[PDB]
């Protein structure tokens, strides 16, 4: 029984700790009600479409049923006077979320043989790995954290769905993948979210290499008519 | 024991196979996307740099 | 003289980090300069292969 948090299009993917800086001093409110309490905890929801921040305290549809229950973890406000941290951990499907009754329907639905069901996910990191390798953004040692040979991924769904966190589709194509219950289905969507980064990175780099070279013609160009003219100039 | 090694290489080449296949079937299906849009990332990427 | 010298140490080393920052600032300034001439141009081949 709280007010539902503003998330202002802020995606907190799971199981990646993130910070969260609603502008609204509202929402402090209810973090301070939260402090008094032995077991404080605070929800993660993603928006739906068309963000309205207005609508988010009036209608409650405008929240995705979807929600990602965690504890808090520690504040901070260096500056601002509302700088919660939050992360994925219970993740939840509310069946009416302006109702909340809830149940951690955290369907792992699996195949008998549990030996190649993991490998689909050995060809999304291998994807994943020509993304970090060819446009690093962060280190691949959070990759090197969660490795397949060893075996500290407990809790192989979670890395699925920090994979494919790091597609840069919008919020709603995650709430498309969160719809799929079976898992290679979502792994299959996944797929397609990273493949889609994959082709318009590789036709970046591709472009921008492709104009230095006609730079670097144009260079050589310019050095041959400098060297000429020198020859010209000098000699004869 | 040289053909008990043999068979588990034909069960691993044939899983590597049908895995291989696996994404190349569905990044066949996410080719499927126009190179236009690809265009219109380009188009995208301009107004990026060009504020 | 032990207080001047020091006090001379550190007039060089007032004159010489004004010096430094300036220069590094000066040639940021061209890389800037050059830096953006390099994207326009990317901007101008996006236009070219699909104007």
Excluded: C, W
Excluded at 133 to 151: F, I
Excluded at 225 to 232: D, G
Aim: a neutral charge; glycine letters at 4%; proline letters at 3%.
């Amino acid at each position: 029984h709280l007010p539902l948090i503003a998330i202002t299009r802020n995606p907190v993917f799971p199981r990646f700790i993130k910070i969260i800086e609603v502008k609204n001093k509202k929402l402090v409110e209810l973090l301070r009600r939260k402090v008094r309490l032995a077991q404080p905890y605070v929800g993660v929801f993603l928006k739906r479409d068309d963000s309205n921040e207005s609508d988010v305290v009036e209608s409650l549809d405008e929240i995705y049923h979807t929600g990602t229950f965690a504890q808090i973890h520690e504040m901070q406000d260096l500056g601002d006077k509302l700088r919660m941290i939050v992360m994925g951990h219970r993740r939840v499907h509310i069946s009416r979320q302006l109702e909340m009754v809830e149940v951690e329907n955290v369907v792992h639905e699996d195949f008998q043989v549990t030996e190649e069901v993991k490998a689909l996910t050995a060809e999304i990191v291998k994807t994943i790995r020509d993304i970090i390798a060819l446009n690093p953004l962060y280190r691949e040692s959070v990759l090197q954290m969660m490795q397949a040979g060893q075996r500290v991924v407990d809790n192989p769904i979670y890395l699925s769905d920090m994979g494919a966190a790091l597609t840069g589709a919008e919020s709603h194509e995650l709430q498309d993948v969160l719809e799929e219950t079976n898992i290679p289905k979502r792994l299959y969507k996944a797929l397609s979210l990273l493949k889609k980064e994959f082709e318009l990175s590789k036709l970046q780099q591709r472009l921008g290499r492709e104009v230095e070279e006609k730079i670097k013609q144009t260079h050589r160009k310019y050095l041959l008519q400098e060297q000429l003219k020198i020859i010209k100039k000098e000699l004869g």
